[PDB]
Design a protein around this ligand. Structure first.
Ligand code: BCB
Ligand code: BCB
Ligand code: BCB
Ligand SMILES: C/C=C1/c2cc3[nH]c4c(c3C)C(=O)[C@H](C(=O)OC)c4c3nc(cc4[nH]c(cc(n2)[C@@H]1C)c(C(C)=O)c4C)[C@@H](C)[C@@H]3CCC(=O)OC/C=C(/C)CCC[C@H](C)CCC[C@H](C)CCCC(C)C
Ligand SMILES: C/C=C1/c2cc3[nH]c4c(c3C)C(=O)[C@H](C(=O)OC)c4c3nc(cc4[nH]c(cc(n2)[C@@H]1C)c(C(C)=O)c4C)[C@@H](C)[C@@H]3CCC(=O)OC/C=C(\C)CCC[C@H](C)CCC[C@H](C)CCCC(C)C
Ligand SMILES: CC(C)=CCC/C(C)=C/CC/C(C)=C/CC/C(C)=C/CC/C(C)=C/CC/C(C)=C/CC/C(C)=C/CC1=C(C)C(=O)c2ccccc2C1=O
Ligand code: HEC
Ligand code: HEC
Ligand code: HEC
Ligand code: HEC
Ligand SMILES: CC(C)=CCC/C(C)=C/C=C/C(C)=C/C=C/C(C)=C/C=C\C=C(C)\C=C\C=C(/C)CC/C=C(/C)CCCC(C)C
Ligand SMILES: CCCCCCCCCCCC[N+](C)(C)[O-]
Ligand SMILES: CCCCCCCCCCCC[N+](C)(C)[O-]
Ligand SMILES: *C(=O)[C@H](CCSC)NC=O
Ligand SMILES: [Fe+2]
Lengths: 273, 323, 249, 332
C-alpha cells in the first residue's frame, strides 16, 4: 500500500468535518468526509447519465448527448427526458467538484502544507458555474447552458461563438487565449529547464540554480527565479478562466451585437473618424 | 498564510553572480540593474544579455520581416499616419488572393507576403540556434531547444508546408492582428469545421492539460515553499520532505503520483504535444481530408440532433431552380 | 480520392490509431515508470515490482558524489506512533510529543547531512554576519532588532540575523534568540509575518520555541538540518495546541 | 462599450445547441418606430369609368386601371418616394404625359421592377411583398444603396467625414470593414456576389476526402474565396440585424436538411432575386440617371439585402400593403 516514506505522514488529524470517523485511507486514497460526499454525487451522476443515455438513441460515446431544456421552460424544472436529467446531472457535478476541492483541503492540513492546490482548483469550478449557472440566470433560461456529450458540447461552443459573428474579436476571449498560449510556452520552458539542469547527459556533471538563472539572462536578458516561476505559472494558468469569464458573461447580457463591432469604441472616435 | 508565496517580504540585494560559458562570455553586454517592484514577485536583477551571432542574425532578419510587413501596412492606408494608428489592428500583408498554384506570386498579390515569411523563418532559425547553443555552452540539456523546435515546425506547417502540400500560397496565414485571426475562420470553414478534426482535439487536450498541470504544479511548489520545494534540482538528487509531502498530497488525492523530476517530464511532454498534434492535423488537412465533418460522419463519430424548426431542403437542388 | 485505401480506409483514420498508440506508450511505459524513481518499491523476488521500475540512472553531482535512483533506502528511525485500529488503512497516533518525535506534519526527510553549496563551492545558506556583501534592499524592513511574537500573543525572542541564499539572492531564514534560554533558533520566512515593529509567527506557541532543532555549526546549515527545522514549525500547524487536530466545523 | 440587460433571446435549433437570436430590446424598439412610419393605405376607390389607357396619353404600365384607382396609385407613389418634392418631381406642371424629367422614366421602370418582384420572386417576398416605400422610405434616393466600391456612411442621409468620403484612400480599409460588420475581411462581398451571378458562394467540399483532379495546385480554388464567402455572410447577418444561427447550425454551414432553418432557404432566393434586380432593372439605369447619381465608374446605385431590410430580419417588420394595391403585384 505504502511508499517507502509514506508511513510517517499518515497520522490522524486535519479534518474539516466529522473528526476521526472518516479520517482514514482506502489503499492510496484518503477518504475524507468529502471523500464520502464526492463518491455519493459521482455515483448518482454517473447513474443519472447512463439512465438518460439509455432513454436516448445511440450508444456510441461520441454521439451521446444529455441536453438542457428548451428556452421556454425558463428557470424552472423540466421533464426528465426533455432536459431534467441534465439539471440533475449539473447538480451532481457541482456536488462532486466542491467535494473534491474540500477533500484536497483536508489532505493539505494533514501534511502541514499550503492550501494552494484546492484554491487553484476553485478557478475551473468557478468557470463551470459561469457557463452553466450564472450566465443562464442572467438570460433567464437553463437552455442557454451547454450539453453534456463528448462531441455535442463542441457544437454548443461552435454556435455560441457564431451567435456573436466572430467570437475571436471578443476582448475577454483575446485575453483568455493569450493566457492559454503563454501558459503552455512557460510550462515547456520550465519543465525543459529543470530537466536541462538535472539531465545534461554524457555523464557530464549535474548543474546549479546559478546555471538556471544564467541560461535565461543569456537568452532573453531576464530570469525570474525558481519560486517565482511557480507563482507565475499559477497566475498565468488561473487567468485563462479569470479573464475569459468576463468575455463569456458579457455575451448576451451586456452585449448583443457582433464582437468585431464592439471595437467601434476605438475605430469611431470623432478625433480620427 | 505563507506570504513569501505571494511576494518577497524582505528582498536581498547582493553582487552579481556570473556563470561561465564554454564560449562567448565577452559577448555578454549591459550593466545589471536591480529593480524593487519587479523584485517583489521575481528576481530583481535585469541584464546583462548575451548577444551572439545567432542572436544578432535573428534581430537582422526579424526586422527585415517587420519592415516589409509595416511598409505594406502603411500602403493600405495610403501612408496617412493618423489612419495608420486608428486602423492598425485591421491592416495586414495578405498572401495571394488569386490562384497562382505554387508559382511565385507578384509582389502586389502576396509576393511581399512570401518575402516577409522567408525572413521570419530565417529569424526563427537563428533564434533556435541561440536557444540550443546557449544550453550547450552552459553545459545543459537541449530540452528547451526541442520543445521550441516543435513550435517552429508548427509555424512552418501552417505558413508554408501545408500550402506546398496542396500547392497554393493562398492558404498562408496573413500578417496582421485581425487578419491572422480572420485566417482561422476561413481555414476552418473551408475544411469542414476544425472541431471535427481529431488533431485539433488532441492539441486542445494538451493545451488545456498545460493549464491543469501548471496550475497544479505551481500551486504545489508554493504549498511546499516553506520546506524548500522551489529548490528543485536538490530535491531531485536528494529527496527532501518538500517533495515527499508534494507526492503524498497527489497520491492521496488521485491514487498515483510523480517525482519532483518526472512532473517536469509530464509538463515538458504535454507542452511539446500541443505543437506536435497541431502539426499532424495541418499536414493531414487538405492533403488527405477535405471536410473534417463529413470524415467524422463517414466514420460514425458525428452527432445528429432532431430538427427544431422544419428541416429545409437545399433549394439549389429543387426542380428548375435558378443558378 | 487523395488519401483513400482498400474498403473505406483512409490515412487520417490510421494516423488516429497511431497517435493514440504513441500517447499510451509514452504515458505508461515511460512517464509512469519515471514516476516510480522515488518511493518504490512499496511496503507492508516479486514479478510486478520489477516491471513497474525503470533501469536506474546516476546523477553525477556537481561537487563530487553520485546518486543513483531508484535505490533501497528505508526509514531507519523508530517512529513514535501506534495504530488507531486493526484496519490496514487506518491512521497513526503519535505516542510522544509529535513536534520533537518528528512525526506527521513534523516529519523530516533523511536528506544528506551536507551543507548545500554554491556553483563556486561555498556554503549556499548562511547568515548576514558571514555574507557581509549581501544587504537588505533599500526599502524593505530590516528585522534585526524586532521582537518575535508567537501564536499565544507572547514575545518569544529577538531577531538577530537573516540567512541569505547566495546562489539565488533570497532570504530563507530569520535567526532569533529565544527569551530566557541562551540559544539561537532559525525560522523560515514562510512562517514569518514581517511587520515594521515586529515579526508574527502563528505556527507555534511561545513556549515551543524551546525545542526548535539546534544546528551543527551556528554559521552554516545542512540540507537535513533545514528539513528538521522547517518540519518543526509546520508540525505546529496541526499540533501546537490540542484544538488544531480537531475538526474546524 | 457595453449594452445593459436584459436581452431578448429566441431559439432556432434543437435545445442545447446555442442557436437563436440575441436582441437588446431598446435597439429593436428604435427600429420598430422607424419602420412604423410606413404611411397607411389610402381608402379604396369606386372603380368607375373606362380604363386610363383610353384617357391619358402616355400610360404604358398602369393602363389596366380606372381614373380614380390610377390617381390613388399616383398619390401613394408620391407619399412613398417624393413626399417632400410632390407630383412636380416626376411631371411637368403643364403636361403630365411629358417624360422630360428623368424621374418619370425611372419611375416607370421602377413600377415594372416592383410588379416583377411581387410576381416572380414570391419565393422570397411571399404574401407580404414590397412597395416603393420598402426601399425608398420617403426619399427619391433610397438611404441604403451600393456603388461598385465601398461607400460610407451606409445611410446616405448622413453627411460623410473627410476619411469616410470615397475619394480619400486612407479610409478604404474602414469603408470596407463597416460593410462586413467591423471585420478585417478584405473583400467587397457586394461586387463579388450580389452585383451579378458571376461568382459561386459555396466554398466547402461535399466529400470527406479530397477528390483527385480538383484538389491540387491551380485546379483548386484559392482560400481567398472562403474569406470572401465569410465576408458576404458577415454582411448578410448585419444587414438583417441577426447572426449565423438564424440560418445555420454551425456544426456544418455547408449542410442543409436539419442543419439549416427555413430562413436559409428564403435567403438563398433573396440572393438570386437581388441579382436579377441589379443586373436587369437597376444597373442599366445609368442610361437615364444624371452623373450626380452615378458612382465613380458611371454605375447606377444598386441594391443589397440592407436596401429593403434595414437591419430587420423582415423588412418593416413584415408589414404589407399588397391587398391594398393590387396594381403592384402579383400579376396574372
Ligand atoms: C466559433 C467558436 C469560437 C470559440 C468559442 C468560445 C466560447 C463561447 C467560449 C470560448 C472560451 C475559450 N476559448 Mg474559444 N478559442 C480558444 C480558447 C478558448 C479558451 C482559452 C477559452 C476558455 C475555455 C473554457 O471556458 O473551458 C471551460 C472548462 C471548464 C469549465 C472545465 C472545468 C473542469 C471541472 C471543474 C472538472 C471536470 C472533472 C471531470 C468531469 C472528471 C472526469 C475525469 C476523470 C479522470 C475522473 C483558442 C485558443 C481558439 C483559437 C485558436 O481560435 C478559440 C476559438 C473559438 N472559441 C472560436 C472562434 N470560446 C470560453 C471563454 O472563456 O470565452 C472568452 C468560452 O465561454
Ligand atoms: C467553452 C469551452 C468548452 C469546451 C471546449 C472544448 C474544445 C474545443 C475541445 C474540448 C475537448 C474536451 N473537453 Mg471540453 N470539457 C470537458 C471535457 C472535454 C474532453 C471530452 C475533451 C478534452 C479535455 C482535456 O484534455 O482537458 C485537459 C484535462 C486532461 C488531459 C485530464 C484528463 C481529462 C479527461 C480527458 C476527461 C474525460 C472526460 C469524460 C469523458 C467525461 C466524464 C465521464 C463521466 C462518466 C465521469 C469537461 C469535463 C467540461 C466541463 C465539465 O466543463 C468541458 C467544458 C468545455 N469544453 C466548455 C463547454 N472542449 C476536446 C475534444 O477533443 O472534444 C471531445 C476539444 O477539442
Ligand atoms: C473557427 C475557428 C476555429 C479554430 C481554427 C484553428 C485552426 C485553423 C488551427 C487551430 C489550432 C488550434 N486551436 Mg483552434 N481552438 C482552440 C485551440 C487551438 C489550439 C490548442 C490549436 C493549436 C494552435 C496553437 O497553440 O498556436 C499557438 C502557437 C503558435 C502559433 C506557434 C508559435 C511559435 C513561434 C516560435 C512564435 C514566434 C513569434 C515570433 C518570434 C514573433 C515575431 C514575428 C514577426 C517577425 C512577424 C480552442 C481551445 C477552441 C475552442 C474552445 O473553441 C478552438 C476553436 C477553433 N479553432 C475554431 C473551431 N484552430 C491549430 C491546430 O492544432 O489545428 C489542428 C490550427 O492549425
Ligand atoms: C506549446 C509550445 C509553446 C511555445 C514554446 C516555446 N517558445 C519559445 C521557446 C519555447 C520552448 C524558446 O526557448 C523561445 C524563447 O526564447 O523563449 C524563452 C521561444 C519563443 N517564443 C516566443 C513567442 C511565442 N511563442 C508562442 C507559442 C508557443 N511557444 C507554444 C504555445 C506564441 C504564440 C502563442 O503565438 C508567441 C508569440 C518568443 C518569446 C521566442 C522566439 C523569439 C524569436 O524567434 O526572435 C526573432 C526576432 C525578433 C526581432 C522578435 C523578438 C521579439 C520577442 C517578442 C522577444 C525578444 C526578447 C528580447 C531580447 C528581450 C530583451 C529585453 C531585456 C533587456 C529586458
Ligand atoms: C485554469 C485552471 C485549470 C485547471 C486546474 C485544476 N484542475 C484540477 C486541479 C487544478 C488545480 C486539481 O486539484 C484536480 C485534480 O485532482 O488534479 C488532477 C483537477 C481536476 N481537473 C480535472 C479535469 C479538467 N480540468 C480542466 C481544466 C482546468 N483545470 C483549467 C485549465 C479540464 C478542461 C476541460 O479543460 C478538465 C477535463 C480532473 C482530472 C480533476 C477534478 C477531479 C474531480 O472533480 O473528481 C470528482 C468528480 C468525478 C471523478 C467525476 C464527476 C462526474 C459528474 C458527477 C457527472 C458528469 C460531469 C460533466 C457534467 C460531464 C460533461 C461531459 C463532457 C464530455 C463535456
Ligand atoms: C472506490 C471507493 C469507495 C473509494 C473511496 C476513496 C475515494 C474517495 C477515492 C477517489 C476515487 C476517484 C474518483 C479517483 C479518480 C482520481 C482522479 C480524478 C484521477 C485523475 C487524474 C488525472 C486525469 C490527472 C491529469 C493530470 C496529470 C497528467 C497528472 C500526471 C502527473 C501527476 C501524477 C501530477 C501530480 C503532481 C504535481 C502536479 C506536482 O507538482 C508534483 C510535485 C512533486 C511531486 C509529485 C507531484 C505530483 O504528483
Ligand atoms: C414619380 C416617382 C411620380 C410621382 C411622384 C407622381 N407621378 Fe404621375 N406618373 C409617373 C409615371 C411614371 C407615370 C406614367 C405611368 C405609366 O403607367 O406609364 C405617371 C403618369 C401620370 C398621369 C397620367 C397622365 C399621362 O401620362 O397622360 C397622371 C394624370 C399623373 N401621373 C398624375 C400625378 C399626380 C396628381 C401626382 C401627385 C398626386 C403624381 N402623378 C405623382 C410618375 C410619378
Ligand atoms: C428596391 C428593391 C427599390 C424598390 C422596390 C423601388 N425602388 Fe425606386 N430606386 C431604387 C434605387 C436603388 C434607385 C437608384 C438611386 C436613384 O435614386 O437614382 C431608385 C431610383 C428611383 C427613382 C429616381 C430618383 C432619383 O434619381 O432621384 C425614382 C423616381 C424611383 N426610384 C421611384 C420608384 C417607385 C415609384 C417605386 C415603386 C413603384 C420604386 N421606385 C421602387 C430602389 C428601389
Ligand atoms: C440567412 C439570412 C443567413 C445568415 C444570417 C448566414 N448565412 Fe451563411 N449562407 C446562407 C445561404 C443562403 C447560403 C448559401 C448561398 C448560395 O449561394 O448557395 C450560405 C452559405 C454559407 C457558407 C458556404 C457553405 C458552402 O456550401 O460552402 C458558409 C461557410 C456560411 N454560409 C457561413 C456563415 C456564417 C459564419 C454566418 C454568420 C457570420 C452566416 N453564414 C450567416 C444564409 C445565411
Ligand atoms: C426587397 C425587394 C428585398 C431585398 C433586396 C431582400 N429582401 Fe429579404 N425579404 C423581403 C421581404 C418583403 C420579405 C418578407 C418575409 C415575410 O414573409 O414577411 C423578406 C424576407 C426575408 C427573410 C425571411 C425572414 C423570416 O421569415 O424570418 C430572409 C431570411 C431574407 N429576407 C433574407 C434576405 C437576404 C439575405 C437578402 C440579400 C441577398 C435579402 N433578403 C434581400 C424583401 C427583400
Ligand atoms: C523560399 C521561398 C520562395 C519562400 C518560402 C519561405 C517560407 C518558409 C515562407 C513563409 C513562412 C511562414 C511560416 C509564414 C507564416 C506566417 C504566420 C504564421 C503569421 C502569423 C501571425 C502574424 C502576426 C501576428 C503579425 C503581426 C504583425 C505586426 C504586429 C506588424 C509587425 C510589427 C511588430 C511590432 C511585430 C509584433 C508581433 C507580436 C509579438 C505583437
Ligand atoms: C537557417 C538559419 C541560418 C542562420 C545562420 C547564422 C547563425 C550562425 C551561428 C554561429 C554558431 C556558432 N557557435 C557554434 C559557436 O555557436
Ligand atoms: C486527450 C489528451 C490525452 C491525455 C491523456 C493522459 C491522461 C493521464 C493518464 C494517467 C494514467 C494513470 N495510471 C493510473 C494508469 O497510471
Ligand atoms: C479519387 O478522387 C478517385 C480517383 C480515381 S483514380 C486515382 N476518383 C474517383 O472516385
Ligand atoms: Fe517546477
Amino acid at each position: 500500500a505504502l511508499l517507502s516514506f509514506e508511513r510517517k505522514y499518515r497520522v490522524r488529524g486535519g479534518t474539516l468535518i466529522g473528526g476521526d470517523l472518516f479520517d482514514f485511507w482506502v489503499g492510496p486514497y484518503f477518504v475524507g468526509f468529502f471523500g464520502v460526499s464526492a463518491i455519493f454525487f459521482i455515483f448518482l451522476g454517473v447513474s443519472l447519465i447512463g439512465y438518460a443515455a439509455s432513454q436516448g438513441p445511440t450508444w456510441d460515446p461520441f454521439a451521446i448527448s444529455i441536453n438542457p431544456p428548451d428556452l421556454k421552460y425558463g428557470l424552472g424544472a423540466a421533464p426528465l427526458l426533455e432536459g431534467g436529467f441534465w439539471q440533475a446531472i449539473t447538480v451532481c457535478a457541482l456536488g462532486a467538484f466542491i467535494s473534491w476541492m474540500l477533500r484536497e483541503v483536508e489532505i493539505s492540513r494533514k501534511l502541514g502544507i499550503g492550501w494552494h492546490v484546492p484554491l487553484a482548483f476553485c478557478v475551473p469550478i468557478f468557470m463551470f458555474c459561469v457557463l452553466q449557472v450564472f450566465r443562464p440566470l442572467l438570460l433567464g433560461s437553463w437552455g442557454h447552458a451547454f450539453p453534456y456529450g463528448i462531441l455535442s458540447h463542441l457544437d454548443w461552443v461552435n454556435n455560441f461563438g457564431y451567435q456573436y459573428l466572430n467570437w475571436h474579436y471578443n476582448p475577454g476571449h483575446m485575453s483568455s487565449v493569450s493566457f492559454l498560449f503563454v501558459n503552455a510556452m512557460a510550462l515547456g520552458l520550465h519543465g525543459g529547464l529543470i530537466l536541462s539542469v538535472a539531465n545534461p547527459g554524457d555523464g557530464d556533471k549535474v548543474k546549479t540554480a546559478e546555471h538556471e538563472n544564467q541560461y535565461f539572462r543569456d537568452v532573453v536578458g531576464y530570469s525570474i527565479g525558481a519560486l517565482s516561476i511557480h507563482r507565475l505559472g499559477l497566475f498565468l494558468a488561473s487567468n485563462i478562466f479569470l479573464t475569459g469569464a468576463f468575455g463569456t458573461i458579457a455575451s448576451g447580457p451586456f452585449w448583443t451585437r457582433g464582437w468585431p463591432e464592439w471595437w467601434g469604441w476605438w475605430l469611431d472616435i470623432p478625433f480620427w473618424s | 498564510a505563507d506570504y513569501q508565496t505571494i511576494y518577497t517580504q524582505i528582498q536581498a540585494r547582493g553582487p552579481h553572480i556570473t556563470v561561465s560559458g564554454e564560449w562567448g562570455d565577452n559577448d555578454r553586454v549591459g550593466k545589471p540593474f536591480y529593480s524593487y517592484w519587479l523584485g517583489k514577485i521575481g528576481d530583481a536583477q535585469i541584464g546583462p544579455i548575451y548577444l551572439g551571432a545567432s542572436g544578432i542574425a535573428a534581430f537582422a532578419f526579424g526586422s527585415t520581416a517587420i519592415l516589409i510587413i509595416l511598409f505594406n501596412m502603411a500602403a493600405e492606408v495610403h501612408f496617412d499616419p493618423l489612419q495608420f494608428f486608428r486602423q492598425f489592428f485591421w491592416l495586414g500583408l495578405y498572401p495571394p488572393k488569386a490562384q497562382y498554384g505554387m508559382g511565385i506570386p507578384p509582389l502586389h498579390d502576396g509576393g511581399w507576403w512570401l518575402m516577409a515569411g522567408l525572413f521570419m523563418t530565417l529569424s526563427l532559425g537563428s533564434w533556435w540556434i541561440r536557444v540550443y547553443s546557449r544550453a550547450r555552452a552552459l553545459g545543459l540539456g537541449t530540452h528547451i531547444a526541442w520543445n521550441f523546435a516543435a513550435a517552429i515546425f508548427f509555424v512552418l506547417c501552417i505558413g508554408c508546408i501545408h500550402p506546398t502540400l496542396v500547392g497554393s500560397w493562398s492558404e498562408g496565414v496573413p500578417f496582421g492582428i485581425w487578419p491572422h485571426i480572420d485566417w482561422l475562420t476561413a481555414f476552418s470553414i473551408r475544411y469542414g469545421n476544425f472541431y471535427y478534426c481529431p488533431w485539433h482535439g488532441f492539441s486542445i487536450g494538451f493545451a488545456y492539460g498545460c493549464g491543469l498541470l501548471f496550475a497544479a504544479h505551481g500551486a504545489t511548489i508554493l504549498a511546499v515553499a516553506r520546506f524548500g520545494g522551489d529548490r528543485e534540482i536538490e530535491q531531485i538528487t536528494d529527496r527532501g520532505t518538500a517533495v515527499e509531502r508534494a507526492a503524498l498530497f497527489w497520491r492521496w488525492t488521485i491514487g498515483f503520483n510523480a517525482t519532483i523530476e518526472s512532473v517536469h517530464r509530464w509538463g515538458w511532454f504535454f507542452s511539446l504535444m500541443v505543437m506536435v498534434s497541431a502539426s499532424v492535423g495541418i499536414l493531414l488537412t487538405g492533403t488527405f481530408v477535405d471536410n473534417w465533418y463529413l470524415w467524422c460522419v463517414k466514420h460514425g463519430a458525428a452527432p445528429d440532433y432532431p430538427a427544431y424548426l422544419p428541416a429545409t431542403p437545399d433549394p439549389a437542388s429543387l426542380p428548375g431552380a435558378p443558378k | 480520392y487523395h488519401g483513400a485505401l482498400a474498403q473505406h480506409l483512409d490515412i487520417a483514420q490510421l494516423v488516429w490509431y497511431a497517435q493514440w498508440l504513441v500517447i499510451w506508450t509514452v504515458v505508461l511505459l515511460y512517464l509512469r515508470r519515471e514516476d516510480r524513481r522515488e518511493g518504490y518499491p512499496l511496503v507492508e523476488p516479486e514479478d510486478g515490482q520489477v516491471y513497474e521500475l525503470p533501469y536506474p540512472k546516476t546523477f553525477v553531482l556537481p561537487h563530487g558524489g553520485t546518486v543513483t535512483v531508484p535505490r533501497r533506502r528505508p526509514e531507519t528511525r523508530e517512529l513514535k506512533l501506534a495504530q488507531t485500529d486493526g484496519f490496514e488503512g487506518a491512521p497513526l497516533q503519535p505516542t510522544g510529543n509529535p513536534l520533537v518525535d518528528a512525526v506527521g506534519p513534523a516529519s523530516y526527510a533523511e536528506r544528506a547531512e551536507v551543507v548545500d553549496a554554491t556553483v563556486d563551492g561555498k556554503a549556499k545558506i548562511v547568515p548576514l554576519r558571514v555574507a557581509t556583501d549581501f544587504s537588505i534592499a533599500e526599502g524593505d524592513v530590516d528585522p534585526r532588532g524586532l521582537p518575535v511574537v508567537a501564536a499565544d500573543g507572547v514575545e518569544a525572542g529577538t531577531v538577530t540575523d537573516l540567512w541569505v541564499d547566495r546562489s539565488e539572492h533570497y532570504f530563507r531564514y530569520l535567526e532569533l534568540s529565544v527569551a530566557g534560554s541562551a540559544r539561537t533558533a532559525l525560522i523560515p520566512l514562510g512562517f514569518c509575518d514581517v511587520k515594521k515593529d515586529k515579526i508574527v509567527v502563528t505556527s507555534i506557541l511561545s513556549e515551543q520555541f524551546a525545542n526548535v532543532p539546534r544546528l551543527q555549526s551556528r554559521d552554516q546549515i545542512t540540507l537535513r538540518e533545514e528539513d528538521k527545522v522547517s518540519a518543526y514549525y509546520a508540525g505546529g500547524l496541526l499540533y501546537a495546541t490540542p484544538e488544531r487536530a480537531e475538526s474546524l466545523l | 462599450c457595453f449594452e445593459p440587460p436584459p436581452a431578448t433571446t429566441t431559439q432556432t435549433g434543437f435545445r442545447g445547441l446555442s442557436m437563436g437570436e440575441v436582441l437588446h430590446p431598446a435597439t429593436v424598439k428604435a427600429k420598430k418606430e422607424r419602420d412604423a412610419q410606413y404611411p397607411p393605405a389610402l381608402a379604396a376607390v369606386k372603380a368607375e369609368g373606362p380604363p386610363v389607357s383610353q384617357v391619358y396619353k402616355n400610360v404604358k404600365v398602369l393602363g389596366n386601371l380606372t381614373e380614380a384607382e390610377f390617381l390613388r396609385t399616383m398619390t401613394a407613389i408620391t407619399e412613398w418616394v417624393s413626399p417632400q418634392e410632390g407630383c412636380t418631381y416626376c411631371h411637368d406642371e403643364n403636361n403630365l404625359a411629358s417624360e422630360a424629367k428623368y424621374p418619370y422614366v425611372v419611375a416607370r421602370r421602377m413600377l415594372e421592377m416592383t410588379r416583377a418582384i411581387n410576381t416572380n420572386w414570391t419565393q422570397h417576398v411571399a404574401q407580404t411583398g414590397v412597395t416603393c416605400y420598402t426601399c425608398h422610405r420617403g426619399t427619391p434616393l433610397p438611404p441604403y444603396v451600393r456603388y461598385l466600391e465601398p461607400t460610407l456612411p451606409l445611410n446616405n442621409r448622413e453627411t460623410p467625414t473627410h476619411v469616410e468620403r470615397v475619394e480619400t484612400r486612407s479610409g478604404y480599409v474602414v469603408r470596407l470593414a463597416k460593410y462586413t460588420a467591423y471585420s478585417a475581411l478584405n473583400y467587397d462581398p457586394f461586387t463579388m456576389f450580389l452585383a451579378n451571378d458571376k461568382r459561386q458562394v459555396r466554398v466547402v467540399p461535399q466529400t470527406a476526402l479530397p477528390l483527385v483532379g480538383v484538389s491540387r495546385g491551380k485546379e483548386r480554388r484559392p482560400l481567398s474565396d472562403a474569406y470572401a464567402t465569410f465576408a458576404l455572410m458577415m454582411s448578410i447577418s448585419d444587414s438583417l440585424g441577426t447572426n449565423c444561427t438564424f440560418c445555420h447550425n454551425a456544426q456544418t454551414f455547408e449542410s442543409w436538411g436539419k442543419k439549416s432553418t427555413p430562413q436559409r432557404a428564403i435567403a438563398w432566393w433573396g440572393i438570386r432575386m437581388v441579382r436579377d434586380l441589379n443586373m436587369n432593372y437597376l444597373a442599366p439605369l445609368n442610361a437615364s440617371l444624371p452623373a450626380s447619381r452615378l458612382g465613380r465608374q458611371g454605375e447606377a446605385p444598386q441594391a443589397d439585402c440592407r436596401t429593403c431590410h434595414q437591419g430587420v430580419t423582415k423588412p418593416l417588420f413584415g408589414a404589407s400593403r399588397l391587398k391594398d394595391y393590387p396594381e403592384l403585384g402579383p400579376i396574372k
